[PDB]
Amino acid sequence: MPNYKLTYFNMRGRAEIIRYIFAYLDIQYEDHRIEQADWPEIKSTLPFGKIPILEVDGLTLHQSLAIARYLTKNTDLAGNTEMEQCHVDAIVDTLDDFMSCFPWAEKKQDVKEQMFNELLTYNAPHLMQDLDTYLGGREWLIGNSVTWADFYWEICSTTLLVFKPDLLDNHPRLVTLRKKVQAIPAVANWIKRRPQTKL
Amino acid sequence: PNYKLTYFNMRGRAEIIRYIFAYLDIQYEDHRIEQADWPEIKSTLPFGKIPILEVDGLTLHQSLAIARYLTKNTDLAGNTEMEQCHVDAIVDTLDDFMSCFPWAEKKQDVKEQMFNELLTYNAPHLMQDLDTYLGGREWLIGNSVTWADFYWEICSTTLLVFKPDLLDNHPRLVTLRKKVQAIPAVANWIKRRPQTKL
Numbered sequence: 497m498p499n500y501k502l503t504y505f506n507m508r509g510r511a512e513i514i515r516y517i518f519a520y521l522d523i524q525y526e527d528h529r530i531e532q533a534d535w536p537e538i539k540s541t542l543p544f545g546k547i548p549i550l551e552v553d554g555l556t557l558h559q560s561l562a563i564a565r566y567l568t569k570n571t572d573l574a575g576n577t578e579m580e581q582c583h584v585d586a587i588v589d590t591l592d593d594f595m596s597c598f599p600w601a602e603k604k605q606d607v608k609e610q611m612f613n614e615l616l617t618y619n620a621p622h623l624m625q626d627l628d629t630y631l632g633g634r635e636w637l638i639g640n641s642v643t644w645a646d647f648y649w650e651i652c653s654t655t656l657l658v659f660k661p662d663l664l665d666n667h668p669r670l671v672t673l674r675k676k677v678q679a680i681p682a683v684a685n686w687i688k689r690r691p692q693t694k695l
Numbered sequence: 696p697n698y699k700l701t702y703f704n705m706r707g708r709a710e711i712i713r714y715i716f717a718y719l720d721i722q723y724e725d726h727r728i729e730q731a732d733w734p735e736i737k738s739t740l741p742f743g744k745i746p747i748l749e750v751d752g753l754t755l756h757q758s759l760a761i762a763r764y765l766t767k768n769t770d771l772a773g774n775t776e777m778e779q780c781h782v783d784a785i786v787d788t789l790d791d792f793m794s795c796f797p798w799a800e801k802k803q804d805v806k807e808q809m810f811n812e813l814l815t816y817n818a819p820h821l822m823q824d825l826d827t828y829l830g831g832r833e834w835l836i837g838n839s840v841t842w843a844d845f846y847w848e849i850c851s852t853t854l855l856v857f858k859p860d861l862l863d864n865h866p867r868l869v870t871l872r873k874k875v876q877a878i879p880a881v882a883n884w885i886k887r888r889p890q891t892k893l
């Protein structure tokens with residue numbers, strides 16, 4: 497048994513993909529959440545001043561997608577062929593690119609509001625349409641079994657729906673995919689048992 | 696397999712793939728398009744972006760997903776799962792930074808302001824972080840070159856076009872660039888590639 501400690505804020509955010517992977521693989525870990533009050537303290541110690549980080553047997557890892565890739569290496573979640581592993585990474589990166597456009601840390605309310613609106617109004621539907629086309633009539637995004645891209649799709653879409661509840665109105669196949677992920681017992685169990693935060 | 700890489704006539708996000716092909720001695724069609732070609736091609740792509748890599752007629756996208764696919768089971772990947780994690784983290788740290796720049800911005804006033812903002816405040820912190828993380832080592836991860844070293848040299852090249860003094864107080868990061876550039880396969884590609892701003 498290896499010693500895992502996850503450090504992030506109290507919210508889903510960029511740590512959530514790691515938490516889904518831990519739940520799905522049934523791995524016990526310390527889900528260390530922090531208030532903003534403690535943020536400047538810990539920040540000074542961090543290698544690149546960013547969370548989430550994951551401590552593994554006294555060794556520190558950073559970058560949430562780098563960590564998620566490390567944890568799924570050698571598992572069913574990574575993909576069934578070398579090429580399918582690329583597709584998993586590329587779908588994840590495509591989703592992460594779009595989530596990263598949003599100005600999460602913007603101090604000016606009016607600039608943050610205008611940007612969140614532009615992205616959700618013009619960009620988001622282009623992405624939903626491309627994703628819908630990519631999925632087609634298949635059960636999972638890549639190959640014939642669930643991957644951590646399906647986890648990421650579910651996590652990303654959950655946060656987009658908070659700001660734009662009608663996002664998937666004309667995309668029932670993408671809603672089905674969210675339901676299929678949420679129905680995975682280990683994921684269901686995590687969703688039910690997790691702190692209820694907005695983001 | 697036969698490889699066809701499609702991107703704009705610039706280093707940009709394709710350059711990491713081009714360094715990996717050079718290093719591994721892999722022949723490939725380096726297909727470069729002008730802006731005028733772009734709308735025609737954009738609709739054929741499942742996610743409407745480039746670069747794309749065609750491997751025996753099958754399309755891959757996302758530059759870093761492709762880089763990770765090409766380097767798997769090679770000396771560029773990182774020797775252990777943990778070191779692979781470090782390689783991914785460094786590349787993601789660098790790529791996060793390069794993504795902040797408003798590459799596609801029309802208004803040159805707000806564009807120059809943000810470029811200078813990022814190069815003034817944010818770039819030196821990242822330089823200091825990288826210099827610390829590198830410590831006593833000659834390469835970013837382990838005891839040999841990885842594609843993270845390539846990516847450093849690629850990202851730093853583009854940053855030095857806008858802020859040539861960025862590595863004045865960081866000679867070990869300069870050394871790292873020169874070590875990447877002294878690799879024969881890389882040196883050879885750098886001498887022969889089309890000379891572009893970006």
Ligand SMILES: CC(C)(O)[C@H]1CC[C@H](NC(=O)c2cnc3nc(C4CC4)ccc3c2)CC1
Nearest residue numbers: 509510532535595596600601651652655695
């Ligand atoms: C300390 C502070 C006030 O400066 C910080 C606190 C944390 C904030 N982060 C977010 O609000 C946030 C939330 N969800 C995200 N989800 C994603 C995608 C779905 C995985 C990506 C980035 C996200 C960023 C930024 C400001």
Ligand SMILES: CC(C)(O)[C@H]1CC[C@H](NC(=O)c2cnc3nc(C4CC4)ccc3c2)CC1
Nearest residue numbers: 707708730733793794798799849850853893
């Ligand atoms: C269609 C269009 C005309 O609107 C496009 C054309 C391509 C443009 N992209 C860039 O100029 C560009 C260039 N170098 C880059 N280098 C990086 C560094 C390596 C990681 C990241 C992003 C970059 C983006 C955006 C607008």
Ligand SMILES: N[C@@H](CCC(=O)N[C@@H](CS)C(=O)NCC(=O)O)C(=O)O
Nearest residue numbers: 509510545546547548559560561791
């Ligand atoms: N690409 C990185 C992004 C890390 C990141 O920027 N995280 C934010 C929280 S969502 C943070 O730590 N912000 C601190 C700051 O910039 O002051 C990842 O996915 O881990």
Ligand SMILES: N[C@@H](CCC(=O)N[C@@H](CS)C(=O)NCC(=O)O)C(=O)O
Nearest residue numbers: 593707708743744745746757758759
């Ligand atoms: N994270 C992606 C980004 C791809 C991307 O944004 N590419 C730009 C060119 S640098 C593009 O195709 N832009 C087309 C457009 O915005 O219309 C990658 O690394 O491949």
